[PDB]
Design a protein around this ligand. Structure first.
Ligand SMILES: [Ca+2]
Ligand SMILES: [Ca+2]
Ligand SMILES: [Ca+2]
Ligand SMILES: [Ca+2]
Ligand SMILES: [Ca+2]
Ligand SMILES: [Ca+2]
Ligand SMILES: [Ca+2]
Ligand SMILES: [Ca+2]
Ligand SMILES: [Ca+2]
Lengths: 144, 142, 140
């Protein structure tokens, strides 16, 4: 009716503002959306910001998601924190849900738990991962 | 059709969250968004109105708390929309009606120097009537 | 009919989104990244974002775009160039300009190497070297 047109009109407008919102700090891959705050924070504060925002820290589950996330890191020239950690079971990195990694892109020699105190994960401009100290300041990127 | 709507509602809810991060705060049906920079009142007011809204006008503790978090994140006290320019001592909204809520700091408002008709909010959420010429964080409400 | 409720919410977030780095004029939307880049990288960022470099086709559009430049105090790149046919500036589609706001003496192709266009805080245009870093503004 006069309602099958007020929809496609609202979809077209939303389709438009969708792109506007993602530029320049956003990346959409599938039904997931990455957005960076633009600044760096320790893991716990970064995690708190993402969760209070209604999402969680970047959790790349595929090469495609990792690639999209990587482009935000490249644009900022700042390695970013991921949501995954091996705090509970050392050596075993898991998502917020507790399940083990279904995907990984570790840099050569990582993860190494250097100094026996690396339970967090960072992603570089080259897309590779490194387990790092949670106290370090890294780019804050959330997923929605 | 009705089914293609929830899909649009779902998609919207998501981009709603994406938009508000990190410079946005939603409380009820109101939305606060900071520009991230500081400006004198008149320019701050002009930016908010031309953007289709107005300067932050917290009308409750809940709204004041949400607004406060934007100030805390920026570590920059922000301007509110309310002023007592017309009737000194009587602060009002853009509509002209008197305050329905306030969170003045101890000893405020004081109209210090007989020239404080604007209001700022601190990182602790407290208010202070301040000179309108001062540069404060720009936060609009939509 | 729970649409008008969704339209009222979208009208709201539309405003929130555009503040402060956005400008809507007609059905077009300008948004700046806030930083400066050479033309080729600026063009790549806009296109990968789903749009293109700012392409003001009227005085109204040029005025809205100008306010983003003024707010940043940074001249911005437009999408138009005369790389194919020197002296003939065209949009990405290849069609010739339907509007222009050149500064006095402009398109001069200074040094015989100016094929890109920039817009100043006063809204005037200048053909400039594509290698220069200018504010990145896209249109959607
Ligand atoms: Ca450990
Ligand atoms: Ca570890
Ligand atoms: Ca390591
Ligand atoms: Ca007064
Ligand atoms: Ca006063
Ligand atoms: Ca005072
Ligand atoms: Ca040429
Ligand atoms: Ca030329
Ligand atoms: Ca020139």
């Amino acid at each position: 009716e006069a309602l099958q047109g007020q929809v496609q009109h609202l979809q077209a407008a939303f389709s438009q503002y969708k792109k506007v919102e993602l530029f320049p700090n956003g990346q959409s891959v599938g039904e997931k959306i990455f957005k960076t705050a633009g600044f760096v924070k320790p893991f716990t504060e970064a995690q708190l910001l993402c969760t209070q925002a209604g999402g969680q820290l970047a959790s790349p589950r595929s090469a495609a998601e990792n690639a999209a996330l990587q482009q935000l890191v490249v644009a900022k020239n700042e390695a970013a924190f991921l949501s995954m950690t091996d705090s509970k079971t050392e050596g075993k990195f898991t998502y917020p849900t507790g399940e083990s990694l279904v995907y990984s892109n570790w840099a050569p020699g990582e993860p190494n738990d250097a100094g026996g105190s690396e339970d967090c994960v960072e992603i570089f401009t080259n897309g590779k991962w490194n387990d790092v100290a949670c106290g370090e300041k890294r780019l804050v990127v959330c997923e929605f």
